Amino acid sequence: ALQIPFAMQMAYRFNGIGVTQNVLYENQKLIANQFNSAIGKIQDSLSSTA
């Protein structure tokens, strides 16, 4: 296991789907908020529906 800052790991994950890194870094807060809200929606979906 080789440590690596999570923002840079996500930069690699972006650069692996054909989107340059600067897209993430310039939109890091937007992407972080989108991810957090998505996880919240997952909680709601699992809690409401069996």
Added chain:
Amino acid sequence: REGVFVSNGTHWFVTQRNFYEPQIITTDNTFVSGNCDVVIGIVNNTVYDPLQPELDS
């Protein structure tokens, strides 16, 4: 362009992600996108131009 910026304490190199082979940072290792007010964690360093010495001499 491909790799990651690293530092051995004093100088900033750009290496490939999977094997430590440091290289001077020049404008052919790196590409410009944006400016310094938007990235979170951006540092100050000097990017060497391979063209300026040729023009100088």
